[PDB]
Structure formats: structure tokens, C-alpha cells
Ligand binder design. Structure first.
Ligand code: HEM
Ligand code: HEM
Ligand SMILES: Cc1cc(N)nc(CCc2cc(C#N)cc(CCc3cc(C)cc(N)n3)c2)c1
Ligand SMILES: Cc1cc(N)nc(CCc2cc(C#N)cc(CCc3cc(C)cc(N)n3)c2)c1
Ligand SMILES: C[C@H](O)[C@H](O)[C@H]1CNc2nc(N)[nH]c(=O)c2N1
Ligand SMILES: C[C@H](O)[C@H](O)[C@H]1CNc2nc(N)[nH]c(=O)c2N1
Ligand SMILES: [Cl-]
Ligand SMILES: [Cl-]
Lengths: 362, 362
């Protein structure tokens, strides 16, 4: 059954991919080769063209992503050749450097060897390549609560954080054959961060907020034509609300709205004053201002929604069905100010795609 | 088939209703009577207790309503006795008066005779009993665009609006046997309105905004135990975002965000300034302030979400399944500041319930 699933996924992908690339005549010969290869080895190897276009198709098919207009300009780095933990580490360092691009962020994915028999070759423990640690001991909360379990796992392995609110977690991953993951501290010269200030309110800097420049998701599996690339970190640039309305505002994250209310000079006492709403707007204005001033790529939710409208239009013009998850596509502030709010979306799963997977810790 | 559907819906409703009322022993005798009544007449008549509890159950089951904590205190007015258009008109006037209650709004439903053979006895044309007219002629837009088609239908019938931005539409309804609906102007003494001012920004009154006090939905069908009450207007009090983030802000409604930005002294030129978001917050603060100052009932979205949390808790304690539509329950500003955003809801339809229906015009 294993191999039949593979063959069926392969047929569908190759036909679709080659059609999009204007290579439809080469499909039969390619499929023949693949069938024989599956016959002998139990799997098949993507050409560099297939792998690159597959990762792009996967982004295009990601229902929860508002940023998909730019799917075709994804920078795909093929690292299926890595075999050592130093090579993995260096590939991850390289991804950070080339994606960051001195602040002019390049959407990039680095693809490591795929699962073989469901056997991972490389298992990345980080949720993002750059993320802050979190601690909760004896009532006392420090850093990003979303990182508490991973932070504890790292500290079991001999890492120790300084216990600021913004400790960078080390890269941590396990190779096939190793019982334990290895970890490596991130070189600070590779990691751009942005201090959060407000365009008009000088006191905003008293909050001493900052965030990292580049979100590099490293716990999803890329599936292309039945091949499962469990290790394939990818990044875009942030939409400002991710930082200002979720990471810094959620009560189960940095929980900063009361502090923001205080520095902008409004009371945080009455629901009817809409102080949370006002604080959200100023925090989100500060985030966009701060990234722009530093020269680090970022998009606001209005511009992002306008770009997504164009993606919708482009899909229709290309004769491709559009899929989407309305609940994730609406921004978490002013959603009804976007066209997305007033439309519906088919949340069907189309492959290639990116899929969430279990974390070894918990 | 008609009658079998009726009987099946009846059995389910009576058993559930009588169980909730502690009358479970009376179910068999009541069902016997109902079966005979369906046998002879083709339908059955609800007791006043059944009708009242049915309308309450219908509110409790309304997946899209955040206000359901208060389902059991619905004021149910039984007007199944009306036969004339003057009696309907007077019942609607009465609903407005008693629901308004000098500003201390009472959630109320008035129930008119049900459909017989799918034959309506009373057909209300209004979407809400109180709503503003809308006009679009030769490029020129006045009033509420959502009311354009109904406004045009009224004017076909000899009504004429003054063409302010806030003309009250007449009550308009048709009786069984009449080709044309009749209309009646609303007595202004019955209709509370609130001028919109801002707590801190004096210039806000230059926008000359106002809204009506009580939303009285009059185009949904109440279905209880297989009986279809197509005419059964009901009201609550507003959640402020309905007025400030939808009615006054939507581009296809009053479209006031650019004007709000101007009076609060911010530019409306750059998406990254989040001027729409800032304008939304101030407009919504003004709405809540203005209703509160006048002594007209209103709820903010934070308090509303907290009440809904209690409804969720109450359902669990009662052993009742909770149903909900996440896409309507999240407020249209700061949705992620509410617990609703972070939970999921089963959007199954449970009866009794309220259902949308076709409007005779278009
Ligand atoms: C170029 C700039 C990009 C922007 C502004 C953007 C924007 C976003 C946003 C706002 C989300 C939702 C996160 C949330 O609301 O909690 C998201 C989700 C997602 N994006 Fe994008 N994105 C970008 C690039 C990419 C790229 C390059 C890929 C992959 C090649 C990608 C794949 C996804 C996926 C898979 C999700 C869902 C993640 C999950 O389920 O946890 N995006 N994106
Ligand atoms: C007591 C105060 C009430 C509040 C604050 C409230 C709040 C709301 C809100 C905000 C909506 C969504 C409208 C939108 O977002 O576009 C809604 C929908 C709804 N409410 Fe309530 N509600 C209340 C009372 C009632 C009552 C008394 C009933 C019926 C007996 C009711 C039945 C419904 C129904 C059926 C809908 C869906 C309407 C549709 O599909 O168009 N609500 N409610
Ligand atoms: C349990 C579970 C299931 C599932 N499917 N997804 C998740 C994580 C959702 C998510 C959270 C964060 C955060 N913080 C960032 C993200 C990444 C958002 C993103 C991704 C990219 C590539 C760019 C960009 N601007 N933003 C996603 C958890
Ligand atoms: C095509 C279509 C289908 C469908 N199911 N519903 C609709 C109308 C949705 C709606 C719009 C408005 C408005 N304006 C007010 C409402 C009423 C909201 C409400 C109702 C009540 C009783 C109280 C309260 N505070 N708010 C609903 C259109
Ligand atoms: C159907 C379409 O998604 C539309 O925007 C829905 C979304 N959610 C909503 N939620 C509420 N509360 N009210 C609405 O009118 C809508 N409209
Ligand atoms: C699952 C639950 O409804 C949760 O709040 C979802 C809602 N929509 C979302 N939308 C985005 N963009 N990001 C998220 O993390 C979530 N979480
Ligand atoms: Cl993030
Ligand atoms: Cl309304």
C-alpha cells in the first residue's frame, strides 16, 4: 500500500508540475522512470526543477497564508546532500543569512533529505529557527511562554539561558541514528532584531520591547508528489499584526496591552473605554514604524489583504481553483476592513502542501 | 410527507420542551392530542407555554448570536390572534414601545399567526422594524445603501422619503389575500435615536452621525416543533461594534472612516499608519459613550464575549451541547482579544431556531 500511495501521488504531481512548466510531453517518460525507480528502491528522487516547483506549489496551496501572491518567487535551496550535523548546522546558518539579506528579506526554503521509510534523516526540534526562550518557575514568568517546553528540553541537554525576556534559543536537531539532538548557539551577528518605538509617543521605548526580523518556520513537513520532506524550514517577512496583535499582545504570550495602555496615557480600567483596542492599534503602529525605520521588510495587514486579492484574481485568470481558510486569512485587528472578511473560501487540502507535525518533546 | 415531517418535529420538540419544564410525564397525553389534531386539521396549535419556551430555545440555539446568555429572559408576546392590518400595525407599534422601554431595552419577540399550508398569514417586508432608507440615483448616494431595494419598493407604493441620510422607513407588510402590502409611517415619538459624540474630541459632532436605539429583526422565520412562524420580529440591544464597525464603517454602508480620520486629526493616506484601525477605535468609543450618556442599553464587545463565556459554561453545567458559528461570534474589531477567537465551535443546526427567508422584492 505504501508504494501504491507513493505512485499515485507521483503521477498526479508530475502531470500537474510538468503541465505548469510547459513540459507536458515529457510526462510519460518521466513517469516510466519513476515507476521503475519505485519498483527497485521503494521511492524516487525529484529533479531540481520538480523540487523547486513543488515547494512553490506547496506555498500556493497553503490555505492559511495571506502572503501567497509571491509564491512563484520563492528561493529554493536544495540541501538533500547533507549527511553530517555540521553540514545541517551550516545550512541553517546559511538560510538565516541569505533570507535576512541585510533586512531586505528574501522568502526562502532550505530542503533537507526526506523521510525514507517514514524514517527521518534530520529532525529539527525548533518551531522557528529564530525564537525567544520562555521560563516558568515558582510562579515567575520570563520570556515567551510559547517556548517553555522547548526551552526546558534544551536545558535538559546542557544549554542554559540568561533568563532575559528575549534569550535566543539555540538551533536544536537530531540526526538519524543519534539518540539525542545536538544544539548550537546562534551567532548574534546573523540575527537581526528591531527595537520597538512609536512614531509620536516617546515614552513607548520605556517598554523595552523588541522582536526578531525574520520568521523561519521549521516544524512543518513539505509533501511533494508523495515524498515527505519533514525538514524544510521556510521564511517570509512578517505581517505586522503577527508581532503586534499576537506575539506581544496575547495574554498567553508577552501580554503587553496593560503596559502599552499605561505608556500611551490611557486608563485600562473599563471595557467600554476600548482601551485594549486602542492599545492594540498603537502597538501595531509602533511595530510597523520600527521595522520600516530600521530597513527590515514588513507588510501591514491592509496591504497584505490587497496583495491577496490580486492572488485571488491571478488564480481565476490562470484557471486554478482557489483554496483558503477564512479563519486564518482574516487579520486579528480590523478584519472587516479587508475584502477577505466579506468573502468565503473553499478550505480543501490540495497537494503539494505544508503540514504540521508532532514535536518529540511536550 | 408534509404531515409526517410535522409530526416528527412535533415529537422531538414536545419531549425536549416538556423535559426542560419538568413536565415530562405530560408528554404522552400531549403528543396523543397533537397526533389527532394533525390528523383532522393538518396542523396543531402550541400552548402559550410551548410557544414561549420554543422562542427562548430558538434564541439559545442561534449559532451566530454572541448575546445568548440571556436567552431565558426573552419577553414573548403572543399575537396569534391578529386578523387585520390595523391589528398588525398596532402590534408592531406596541413591540417598539415595550422593547424600547424608555431606553432600558427589553429583549422581546412578537409572534404572529404561522404559515398554514406554506401560506403566510402576514408577510413583513421590513428587514428591521426601525431602519433608515437608502437612495442611489444618477451617481448620487444618500442614506443606507443596504436599504436601497426596500426603499424603492416603498416608493413604488406611494411612500416618499425626505432624502436625508436618516429617513425612517415606514412599516410595510402584506396580509394573506392582498395583492399589495400596506405601509404606515413610524410615529417619531416611538423611535429613540442617539446622536454620536466622542468623550474627548469635540469636533466629532461635526460628522452629524446618529443611529437608532433598538435593532428589531423582522425577516427571519421562527420554527418551533414543525410550525413555521414567518412573522415574528425580535430585538435585543446593540453590541457597539455592530453600529461602529459595520453600519457606519463598511464601504457598502455609511462609509465614514475617512471622515472620522479627518475629525480626529490623523491623515488617511498611508496603510502603514493604520488610520482605518485608529478611526475604527475612536468611532466605536464614540458609539458606546453616546448610548451610555443617553441612557440607552448597549454592550461593548469585550463584555459581550465575557457574557458568552458564561453561556458556554452554563450549557456545559446543564449538560447541553453548545453550538456556534465562529465566523459570526468573533467581533469585527480586536477579535483575538476575546476568548472566542482561540476556541472552536460546532456549527450544527439545532431546532427550534430562527431562519433567514427570501424577500419578495429584490
Ligand atoms: C512573504 C511573506 C509572507 C507573509 C507576509 C506571510 C503571511 C502569513 C501569515 C500572516 C500567516 C498566518 C500566521 C497566523 O496568523 O498565525 C501565514 C501562515 C502560513 N504561511 Fe505565510 N507568509 C509569507 C510567506 C510564506 C512562505 C514563504 C511560505 C512557505 C513557502 C508560507 C507558508 C505559510 C504557511 C504554511 C502558513 C500556515 C502555518 C501554520 O499552519 O502554522 N508563507 N503566512
Ligand atoms: C440582548 C442583546 C443581544 C445582543 C447584544 C445580540 C448580539 C448579536 C450580534 C452581535 C449578532 C451578529 C450580527 C452581526 O455580527 O452581523 C447577533 C446575531 C443574531 N442574534 Fe443576537 N443579540 C441579542 C439578542 C438577540 C435576541 C433577543 C434574539 C432572538 C430572540 C437574537 C437572535 C440572533 C440571531 C438569530 C442572529 C443571527 C441573525 C442573522 O443571521 O442575520 N439575538 N446577535
Ligand atoms: C498546533 C498548531 C497547528 C498549526 N497548523 N500551526 C501552528 C502554529 C501557528 C503559527 C504560530 C506562529 C507563532 N507565533 C507563527 C506561525 C508562522 C506564520 C508565518 C509563516 C511565514 C512563512 C511567514 C509569516 N509572515 N508568518 C504559525 C500550531
Ligand atoms: C443574506 C443574509 C443572511 C443572514 N442569515 N443574515 C443576514 C443579515 C445579517 C444581519 C445584518 C444586520 C445589519 N445591518 C443586522 C443583523 C441583526 C444582528 C442583531 C440581532 C439582534 C436580535 C440583536 C443584535 N444586537 N443584533 C443581522 C443576511
Ligand atoms: C459571508 C461572509 O464571510 C461575511 O463576511 C460574514 C462574515 N462574518 C460575519 N460576522 C458577523 N457578525 N456579521 C456578518 O454580517 C458577517 N458576515
Ligand atoms: C483554532 C482557534 O480557533 C484559533 O484561535 C485560530 C483562529 N484563527 C487563527 N488565525 C491566525 N491567523 N492564526 C492563528 O494562530 C489562529 N488561531
Ligand atoms: Cl511568529
Ligand atoms: Cl443593525
Amino acid at each position: 500500500e505504501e508504494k501504491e500511495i507513493l505512485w499515485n501521488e507521483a503521477k498526479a504531481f508530475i502531470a500537474a508540475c510538468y503541465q505548469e512548466l510547459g513540459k507536458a510531453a515529457e510526462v510519460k517518460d518521466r513517469l516510466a522512470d519513476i515507476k521503475s525507480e519505485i519498483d527497485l528502491t521503494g521511492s524516487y528522487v525529484h529533479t531540481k526543477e520538480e523540487l523547486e516547483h513543488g515547494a512553490k506549489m506547496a506555498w500556493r496551496n497553503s490555505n492559511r497564508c495571506i502572503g501567497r501572491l509571491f509564491w512563484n518567487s520563492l528561493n529554493v535551496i536544495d540541501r538533500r546532500d547533507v549527511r553530517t550535523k555540521e553540514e545541517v548546522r551550516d545550512a541553517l546558518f546559511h538560510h538565516i543569512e541569505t533570507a535576512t539579506n541585510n533586512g531586505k528579506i528574501r522568502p526562502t526554503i532550505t530542503i533537507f533529505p526526506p523521510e525514507e521509510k517514514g524514517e527521518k534523516q534530520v529532525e529539527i526540534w525548533n518551531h522557528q529557527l529564530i525564537r525567544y526562550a520562555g521560563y516558568e518557575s515558582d510562579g515567575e514568568r520570563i520570556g515567551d511562554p510559547a517556548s517553555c517546553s522547548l526551552t526546558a528540553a534544551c536545558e535538559e541537554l546542557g544549554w542554559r539561558g540568561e533568563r532575559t525576556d528575549f534569550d535566543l534559543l539555540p538551533l536544536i536537531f537530531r540526526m538519524k541514528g543519534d539518540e539525542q539532538p545536538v544544539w548550537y548557539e546562534l551567532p548574534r551577528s546573523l540575527v537581526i532584531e528591531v527595537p520597538i518605538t512609536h512614531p509620536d509617543i516617546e515614552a513607548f521605548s520605556d517598554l523595552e520591547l523588541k522582536w526578531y526580523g525574520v520568521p523561519i518556520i521549521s516544524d512543518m513537513k513539505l509533501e511533494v508528489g508523495g515524498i515527505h520532506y519533514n525538514a524544510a524550514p521556510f521564511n517570509g517577512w512578517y505581517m505586522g499584526t503577527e508581532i503586534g496583535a499576537r506575539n506581544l499582545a496575547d495574554e498567553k504570550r508577552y501580554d503587553k496591552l496593560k503596559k502599552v495602555a499605561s505608556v500611551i496615557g490611557i486608563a485600562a480600567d473599563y471595557n467600554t473605554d476600548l482601551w485594549k483596542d486602542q492599545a492594540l492599534v498603537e502597538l501595531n503602529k509602533a511595530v510597523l514604524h520600527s521595522y520600516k525605520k530600521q530597513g527590515v521588510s514588513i507588510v501591514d495587514h491592509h496591504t497584505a489583504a490587497s496583495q491577496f486579492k490580486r492572488f485571488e484574481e491571478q488564480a481565476e485568470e490562470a484557471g486554478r481553483k482557489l483554496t483558503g481558510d477564512w479563519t486564518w486569512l482574516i487579520p486579528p485587528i480590523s478584519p472587516a476592513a479587508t475584502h477577505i472578511f466579506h468573502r468565503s473560501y473553499d478550505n480543501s487540502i490540495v497537494k503539494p502542501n505544508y503540514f504540521y507535525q508532532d514535536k518529540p518533546y511536550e
